[model samples]
Target: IEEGKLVIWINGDKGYNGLAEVGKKFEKDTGIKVTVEHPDKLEEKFPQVAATGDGPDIIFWAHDRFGGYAQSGLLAEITPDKAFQDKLYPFTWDAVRYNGKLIAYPIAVEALSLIYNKDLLPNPPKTWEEIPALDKELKAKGKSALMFNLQEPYFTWPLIAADGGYAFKYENGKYDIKDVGVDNAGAKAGLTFLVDLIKNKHMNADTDYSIAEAAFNKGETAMTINGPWAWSNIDTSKVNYGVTVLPTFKGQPSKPFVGVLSAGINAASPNKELAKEFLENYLLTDEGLEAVNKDKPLGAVALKSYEEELVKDPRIAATMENAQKGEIMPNIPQMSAFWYAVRTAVINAASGRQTVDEALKDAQTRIEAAAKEAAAKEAAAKAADTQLFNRAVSMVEKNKDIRSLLQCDDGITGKERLKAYGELITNDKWTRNRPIVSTKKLDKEGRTHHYMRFHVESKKKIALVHLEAKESKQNYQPDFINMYVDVPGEKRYYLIKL
Candidate 1:
């Protein structure tokens, strides 16, 4: 709300720094200053901040949040000029709308595609049936055929949806959240395909994010399923890679989860009109978008005018093609239940903890319960708790990398870090999920550490509670916490600081 200045909130990852480069030019041409800020946990923070009328004028994020934000009255509905609308792929319009109202501007679209080493894989397979033979041939050469982060639902969706597996029933232009489809026959077959790969040793059962990246980067694997964000990180020196749409599964096309990144005005912003002008004239144009895209590459260009320049990078062009074949991600508050339940189902099924039928049926039940909670205007406690637990684990992984660089042992722990993130459950809400408490013997130093284990996604998470004071219920803030995180391929203990 500063005079002659526009502020934007976005995440720091995924090459968003290019927006600053565009901001520089925007300032010169429009005589209006633009400030781009990367705030932590934007999804959780935006609604609270905007409701207080103290958030940024503009915010950029994936279109999957469009419906929730619009429903909550957090976004200012937009109506772009006809020329601008005409310049983008028509399908993109569906992602940024809620109840037929345009709620945001679609910046770029993305979907997982087949990225293969051209030297190792001369031609990508046209069907999943060919993968086993390809794996055998590669095995003779001390290589593997293909791999993706097996634990990630995002990466596994193409396989799951090949026949008829879906998160919700979309009919008559509306999503029937009540009719969940994760346990359908097609879903079971797709999950069995993943399990058979592990059983046959075609790919490792322990292929997590790090494992998949290592295999592809070291040229140990010929092909990987990934998105455009992966292009910059590839070791081009070792592997000559080309991208194409993923192969069909059982003769059915693999439908990935397609999502669009978008920019929108905060409903509470005082400079709504000015922010709109800035977005249309300086942010949405091909030249402006190209500037942001220069340093840190964006996903496939949403604007038809930018496609010519965008396709120069072959990887991005492949993702663009894949996006056309993908199913747009469902944008609803109920989707909160989908990630938590489905990820657990996928991990359990892949890791052999449960049969595909049992795991997916559990997910279906969990999602249905969440729908009931949504109707009652209440959060689904179990799903919300597990989602936060998973988010905490990921934050720890990221912070470990960052903190290790500083060689500092006394920073924030993952649970403490969650303070910055706002989600369905607050700290107290999830913490109230009772944990089985035990204690270690008091050391000679006169310190007693209480260990508590909580359930998350059919697994247990260990946390330490310190009872240092006379009152037994003193704040359970331990200076350090150890976790036996079940990262695929490497199950290790991380003793991190709180």
Candidate 2:
């Protein structure tokens, strides 16, 4: 018999199905079937598909997307009662809460810490001043003292945050996106520390996540900055390592960005009450928590009692200890702009393309502009010209080259290409109204070339539709259309011509 069935989506990269055992038990107990799925591109498609009331009943992911989901009304509120609240850590609630309302069930917590090889350095350096000397000593072995994804804002935030640097101002339990401080005095000081470290040869400027992880796993580097999740891979590498809090900067503790993994219910789900029952009655139980974490335990389970057991592993203990001192990553969508701006500034400064002040100043300007653009885009979505928007979608569908060029990544396979095309047509931000139209005389034949441009805005860059056409005596017919992408801080636009 077709009955109440709950659908849940998790990222495929997570490897094992943590919820399978609990799901079987839930079905047996309540006569309701539960399907746990690992869908491709869950992050990108969830908000888009779920907005139309077609998403899974539950989504297992990080709490960072909470604000955006709540703002769009895609997440259902699942407030925990007193009994449920008493057992879990208070901070976990803060991670999934938006404007005093809890919208998801916090599953686990994580934060970055210093991971050092005991074989190379018996005692880990506790301060930034201690690094250069350690690097000099390690030079004999052709090694650096420390390494991390230098250009990634998430990995370097400990240093950036230690000096009072912040992406957004937080006061009275709210974030002020307009008050951006990425280029402030404290932030500048933090980025300067990284610049100086690279200049002094204490760390490598070219180290990205893969290089850093590979170097550490191979024991080529003495120490690294990473989180509990990284240990899952590093443990198999058989490296003798120890985890500790991040090094201090000028006598102040460096703070990592803390985050929580959570399960959010879809507000549009037809089985909202049943989903809630599963969460409150089944998932929160001792047996369920154990089964959910059976395959590979999450970083510091949210339940206080369960975490006590997990803390026996020093890796989890270190992450949890640092998490206490770290700031919970701001859940607002504006944080997307903050991350992009900071990463750009970091890379520019590290590469000597721009001075610290110049890079940061540019980032500040971009961050403010992007934040304002996000707000304006939201307003546009609410009251957009419907007919004009539908016409834009039709225009997109008719142009094959335009669809092909939007593939962003050339390496994507057939399935992903279809997904990309599907997402592009449904996404309204790509087209709103009135594409840019212009004319220019190019040939000796005196024929005027007409161009129609459609602007698509995203967190990373601005994309536009370009076409070549000539005005005949009758009308203007397009020869072909191409995608033109404008990336920030670049002089050239990437043109993917048909």
Candidate 3:
């Protein structure tokens, strides 16, 4: 330990260009060196080693990854003073919390915007409604108006956001999981517009990330929507380009989903406090801010004063402007479910495979079903736990001397002896008259080994009894196990032992 040092892993995308510059600045400020590991595929690899203590002390990544990482306990709680917190934008905090615990520090922010080939579309439209002429002209010249990946739902979420199609509605400053708005009016309007574009050959849904980027870079396409991170790939020599805010529709801008580039401290790190100190003082500080924007400036940073300087750059300005009108990407774990359904709906709608209403409705239905399934499984678990606590009690009700029957004595001379120490009480809500019917166990009290197969087509009454030869392992049997159903007209108290 001749020198104080630790490793920080940054994904190749962001770290490839400027992380070393920031690393050196960090070393200069703290006298503690950092080895910035800019490895390919950090996302897939990080989770493998992050909690093992053999991993790096810190990880610099997008805020979207924060939810899953923090939930698994791989990230340490990021605690900063109010003075420090006041330095970043108000929206950045949403990206830092997971299940309401702050687990990362916000360092930079970016959102998608329109980047056009200056030569082809000299006057890029400020609103989507302006693209009609370009689309018609491009067709005559055999070019497309925009080139962006449709397979990636992230790229198109802005259109959804622009029209008030929130992935999840916020309530009291937090996400209300019950209120999903993927199929709202804004969604139908926006998606319908995109569908028309795809059908008319104005946009291509089949192109992927590399395909779209390459096409735009080679000037095969006139325009595209991408984030500030795409700056390095522009190949300005081949593609004359300019950046502008995402186009509007009906005077409303396409509100791209803005994200924060945040840093997470490894909870397993022996130097967690030191890692926090380095992040706060060296990178987030004004002097530290200089290093972050040194070689490759991110669109905007957490420090507001520094952000002013960043906005002067055309790309950052365009992105930050779009971000101003955009929604902060919800950092809750449930957001993961939105991606699959939204992608499916958008593709199906764009390709004319489904009507807009049908596609959007199907997406919402899938999301609600998934949420319900998770909740049901949780309730089932709790019911099983309750029954486990009272299984022996129920067994006693089925046979008054069940436990005593454990030993049937010296049977040599027609004699039976009872073992000691047993009771006939239940921890259940009731005891004396309770029936101990188990779906998992059978009792031959009557003909068909009549173990109750209670069916509930509702919350209050048994719909009907299930015939035997059916598996009933998971039913959370009706609660009236001990209460007898009295027949009023028949005037019967009947036997409670049915």
Candidate 4:
């Protein structure tokens, strides 16, 4: 037996089992005493262990939570050499870095993708525009289109990003704490799409995460968006399934949140150097990579050489490809607020407690406020280090203008830039109008619906305004007047300025 023993604490039993097997293998290879300790309530227990100042020699955790521990000074910085750093994927290293120090060794990574029942729809829709019609078709056949955990905010990031919007900007190669994209026009459009799904009775938000997955497995729903963690629980044989990249909107691909779980050593431990050596050897080895991948097949973070093999498993490859467009989940401490704010907005929108516009605006306001508070706290601590605060302030200023533009009341009808061409502009400069040029015949459903033309006067300037009386019901008083803007070649359309 070795003179000293190495102890490690992990989060869950499944993960612990996998690591324990790897630890046994490593122990057999080397004369080291390895002990695995997994407590019932790790989140509550780990801190108590750390407080005692005599906890395990190593710890494993989800990369998303690293920001909290690092900020609290509960983690130790790892100083692996250049050769070792180069071997791992860039994203893996980025996730483990807190401020300027490397704090963890990556074990596994996960990214979200769209999973569909091939038996229902052989090929999944490639864009958001197609989903509504697809849902209608499914409903005609007595089936539903898809469902998701509306309660989980992380799942919606891809939809938000695909609409040319983001929860927060990544400036100077780091995540900006402010929320700029919550009420963004593109994001609102994305939310509208999701709302339409529920309004049309094509999706059910009441279904929790597990229930939705079960429905998909049972061939009740056509498709769903989920991560690799779901593979083990799903029934692969009940139906022919296909995994594919998320759909795009306005030519922009959806970007999911990339999550990585890494390994970190205890700085106070006498076996720190040995722990680092073990991680360096095991994480980079082919067997180690395969073991991790097989257990949780999102993608290999450290083993790029195995990408081809990883993709060979159609489901795994499609998910990795989907995740490739994603930004690594921010590791900043303020990320907690970001996630909560997003979830609150999405839940409100999903439950009809607030309109999508109202919910998103509220979320944006909350996030900006929280980010500013955090920046102020940081500034108070290090008055000289104003770089982050300055950047955050600049971001807030930019978002203020963006928010006004998105919520403007002007009845301009065109594409993004062409919106300026619509003449009847609203006095409320912040609101942009969705144009109404034509009306659709009312169906028996008797839902008050209006057809509006979204006119793109130029590539960048667009306007949305209500159509003339001839196209609308006589009893309905139009909210704004329609004016016109001259474009070089395109025919002039009525623009409404409120």
Candidate 5:
């Protein structure tokens, strides 16, 4: 007889206590037997269990690991119905969708934001450009400007993006593994900024996350970039703290990678449908939202209702705002290679093992090779599918239209058009020159999604051009377009066309 129970495996650490609480509540309400297993060294144990086809019905994890599982074909595509999905944030759903298929249901979302001590630095630096001088000022007064774990890859990507760079590009709805933006001018400048801080001894890179949080609590460091999870571990009583969205230098804002914990069902489980029901009822409900919100473990990704309900909580708002700035981290299998290359580039640059340019170049080369290998294998597996060829041709046509729009001719001709194109291309404003800034997205309802602001400028503004697949009910519409321009003194917006 198949037991009509949902079995879950979670990381057994303080970092994952929130999942344990949800498990208890899930069992209480559904009368479905809920078995919660806390395993040690989950990073290793998870794959081993999953490989044997004996994995749990659901697992709680960050999306960073999804790249690995997604590549190995060990996970199932699990899409919740429209009714359930409508209640969730688009950003959350965006994170779990791998290659247009929903593979997981997200529970929590988090972003790296400005974590500062009110007593030491009443106002945190508003942009990355201001960080160095602020660090100097703090050091002169016998304090450090920031504390972060330089060794960890999680903290590294944000810093790279803060300087208007990305590890990969999602061009024309496809992941372009060859485009490594880390070596771009803006990214190099960002890395140089961090290196300068370390060289000047204004920031400590050797400190671990826990120690950094402790230092901030003790007023040893004035500011740091961290998420909500750090709150529980920090001793907030001793210091006054304030949280805010990250500052920018040129393009859009410094968007952090949004981390999410998603639920996946076991393919072999006899009660797969029942497990799905339990997940839908327990994980996607108002009660479930409240249970997670109370602990403030991480930001909820389900819906705006939870955010609206918990607006009074400063930590929740800050983290959510940070999350709003992020792009959905890729869930494709090839993403693992991309991440490995990115980590290698960032770590090498930080530790002085490689220059920013060299490290990024190496990463780009490795990712390209890996992507080609993956593509070859995929082509072999689906050689008979003419649909693949059709899709490729369709993508190229879409790209051409988008490229024309980005380089749109506003009826200018001859020298004027040439001048305009030159100005547009050479102007620092048009270049990926700034760090964290804002861009607007107009939705199908014509309402502006102000929540999404931080966007990195592509190598050429041309790279920003792309067409999105229309929703089922809605006809094809170019949702929004991103452009780079000089905001001058204040982060203002001006529209110009050529």
Candidate 6:
């Protein structure tokens, strides 16, 4: 039993409880001691622990980081038996593999899907093409056909990928990370459909994550695109909803990205044999998987025979179907840049400011350029990003005049300031009724610029000032802008970045 002890780090409450229950039962049958340590910031803590040889036997986490961990030699390569491997979805492997070796064992798949309000869309359209007419129906009822952040690439990628626009095409069972296909004919066609949906008056470009979610939960849309994480956010009393696989478009499947909830072995574990055996015999086995499932349900089970017995609820069935039909996310580090690029492209395309080809091409171009730039200057930038929070924290703590530096002045920070940053924030191209504020020059020694501050007292004991401002031009996003806080009682000022 390798001294009858094993430990792991599992994310979220549901997964931890499910695995803990499975672990409790597992010890009796297998005579191995298992401990589940609930830890916050598993990803943040992983590298230090792995490098120091102080990590758990197994690290249960998202599939995305497996490749990097495998590359760093933190993960022991899993040689899953061919028969055993066949039980899990083939696509799940794409997410967990590095150089054709399984770095993690995939347990669940969360895929993007359509959550529909039953009253509005009794028979949901099978494809996105039908959304406009449905939007008309929803509009008649003083609602929108669909509630979704159309401009957000994360949620919209399904529609694009469904139409054949891949971030990177998998060639001969491996990702061709260099050959991005986001700007391909398929990507354009896919984006064009979304643009058309907007043009036909279904969605607003201003719809954000919260807006879409709130609207859907409040029965504002007949249908919406999101995942199961929003399950608890919905108001069940007001909205009778149904979950299903995303509809087809132009007669092709609307595939989304399926992120797998997975686990992997620690390379430094002394009980490697026992750890491997536990994963294969018990974890993958029906009994172990079911134990976890009973405590908390997992995504479409990797085992088909086990799945067939679960009496197909519409939500589970749709989730399973979507996972089956969707594209699996790759674990490579370059995927980060791809996400940002595609996000910008989707916004441009959805807003109708750029043609499908133009929008996607911009994404491809940005990704390529940014990828090259990042690769060249990675060592320096890694220090900046990984150490990002601390730098902001330092200014907030030591600097007593954080409020003085943060004042959103009483006058004139305008279109001219916006122009200096990149484009005019007030420009109609950016928006018609944009809340424009700012200065022509970077202030606070180039760390910050113009800001408009409005003070509000939250409680008798608390004072809050909302600072709307432009961050330094040197930063990646405007969100890097600083916020100044008044301590309410003391003359102290603290800072938080927006």
How do the predictions measure up, each by TM-score?
Answer: 0.71, 0.72, 0.68, 0.70, 0.67, 0.72
Number of clashes recorded per candidate: 0, 0, 0, 47, 11, 5
- Which residues of candidate 6, in runs, are more than 4 Å off? 1-4, 370-498
Candidate 1: Cα lDDT at 113: 94
Residues 182-256 of candidate 5 have per-residue lDDT tens digits of: 567767777777766666677655767777877787788898788776766565445778888777756567767
10 residues in a row with least lDDT, candidate 3: 441-450
TM-score of 5: 0.67
- Model 3 misplaced stretches (Cα beyond 4 Å): 1-5, 16-33, 39-41, 44-50, 137-144, 204-215, 218-221, 295-297, 373-498
Worst 10 residues of 4 by lDDT: 440-449
Which window of ten consecutive residues has the lowest lDDT sum in model 6? 415-424
Candidate 6 collision pairs: 4-33, 126-248, 127-248, 408-451, 413-438
Residue pairs with backbone overlap in model 2: none
lDDT of 3 at 458: 18
lDDT of 3 by residue, 350-405 (tens): 77789999999999988776555545543664465345324422433233232222
Sort by lDDT, best first. Answer: 2, 1, 6, 3, 4, 5
Which residue pairs does candidate 1 place in steric collision? Answer: none
For residues 1-498, could you state the per-residue lDDT of candidate 4 as single tens digits? 122667877765334555666677778888776777877776556555554345667787777676766655556688788877776666677777775668888765678888888888898899877888888889899887887776687887788767766766766555667656778998888777777777777676676787788788888889888887776666554677788888887778888888777776654466777677667776456766666555544353545666656666888678667756776787776666677888888888888999999988898888787777767654553442222223222332234333233443333572232232222432323434421223322212211222332332323334332332212246433222333333333454333333
Ten consecutive residues with minimal summed lDDT in candidate 2?
418-427
